[PDB]
Design a protein around this ligand. Sequence first.
Ligand SMILES: [Cl-]
Ligand SMILES: [Cl-]
Lengths: 296, 296
Amino acid sequence: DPLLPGFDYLTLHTSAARLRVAVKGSGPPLLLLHGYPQTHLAWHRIAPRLAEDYSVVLADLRGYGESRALDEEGADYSKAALARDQLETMGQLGFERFAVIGHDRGARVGYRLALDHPQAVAAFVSLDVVPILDNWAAVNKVFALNAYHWFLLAQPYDLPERLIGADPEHFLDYTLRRMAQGRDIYHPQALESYRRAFRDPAVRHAMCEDYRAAVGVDADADQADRDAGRRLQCPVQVLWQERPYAAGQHPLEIWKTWAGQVEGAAIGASHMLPEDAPDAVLEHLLGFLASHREAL
Amino acid sequence: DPLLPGFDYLTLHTSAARLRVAVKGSGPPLLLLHGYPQTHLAWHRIAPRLAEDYSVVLADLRGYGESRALDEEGADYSKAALARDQLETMGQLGFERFAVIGHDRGARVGYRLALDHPQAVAAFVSLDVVPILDNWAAVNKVFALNAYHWFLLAQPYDLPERLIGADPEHFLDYTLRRMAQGRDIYHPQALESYRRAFRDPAVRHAMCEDYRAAVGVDADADQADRDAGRRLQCPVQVLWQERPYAAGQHPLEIWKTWAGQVEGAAIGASHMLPEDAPDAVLEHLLGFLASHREAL
Ligand SMILES: [Cl-]
Ligand SMILES: [Cl-]
């Protein structure tokens, strides 16, 4: 089967970025946002099916893949900035209000977009992500061992850039295998795209900047919303990895503290839901989008 | 001033290691144990003064500096194994019972030695270290950011070896500056010795193995002692960095849960007490050793 058949590849010029986007379909708009260390190609098992019924927009996050900040010295890689990129992207394409489906860092862009710009987000789906404020509250020995890179990549410039940049393909391949729990989920051609992006020192730097923002400004934004009692205003679906969750850490429970309309389900796969469990994800997504068709 | 004037450099052949040792003095024996990413030369501002009144033994920990495990494929780098190296070292030199002064990883060797072999340890001094069990209980977001390397270096073989090995001098120099809080504390000739050790891939691997053991077997040993109610049997002194401590985390408080005879003081310096605050350390050490002369 070919990758993203019928998708039209665009480069959008926005106020602060040059963004790679791929689009297909007609009907209500959906924006799909990948995570780390990937690109929009992570959606290749999901996006074709959705494009049969919806307007589907796939984007590389600022700094990832083929998307770049225009300021290559000191750009803002906070989730708030990347959320504004999404508003500009969808606006240019003709959409002022749209559903957002995110995985990993893209879910973090997505919920920040929903909180900051509730008029723009019709529905939100998180694939195996809860807000960073909740993650930081969960840090203990096992968390920090499991997610050591959250701490490495957030160290001050240029410590992690120097380490991860020495043998970029080794580190990329190690990371993808680990995130997949050793499962054979990566299409060899999607892999080459992830590899080429990671060989670019600007991409690696942007990734570090994402992780620095997660520690700092992104967490501060989440706290300000929590302080204000601000919640997502749209229907929310969370699809999470089947694993044990400590008290207070179950993703459905967490999302119910951030939104009044929440549903979800466990999926028996790795964290890499788009590539590992696309049929299960599709079944849940299609049902959610159909059930909230009025919201769209 | 010359480095370690009058110290006699030896290589000891023990059951499991070839150990670099430097000795000077006469009288009651003291064993001084450096930490990461250093060698016995870290004691150069302290050991000469002590050798005026005591038998002073400086050792490179197994795998650090010029000390090596005989098994270079699968050696044991647990604190228990390095504690046995100390028993063999001091025994070969003519001492069955001795005081131990440790800094950083060497304090961790030291307290494990005192717990496992209480008949051998007359007195114990910890420079800015508490037991690893207590450290792990303290892990939160800020701990993991500050001490990110505790999590990096404990990742499975050969992830951290690959990262830290790419540009060893960059990583060593970064780490030393950070641990010193930017203070100009490293004698340029001691530095060259730390650098040469870190350029050896076997040393870097042994360091990773230390950090892996800290997560695993070392913590398990501490828990077994806590479960058994086993405490250090000798007088203990702890000299700690002056900084705020959360409830339960003050080093004097912690050591009092591990030993019935504890004293200590705060020192206004970085974590690198031997090099940063040698006069303050000496004043406290000399008074402690003199006050417990009978124990010796
Ligand atoms: Cl994530
Ligand atoms: Cl330590």
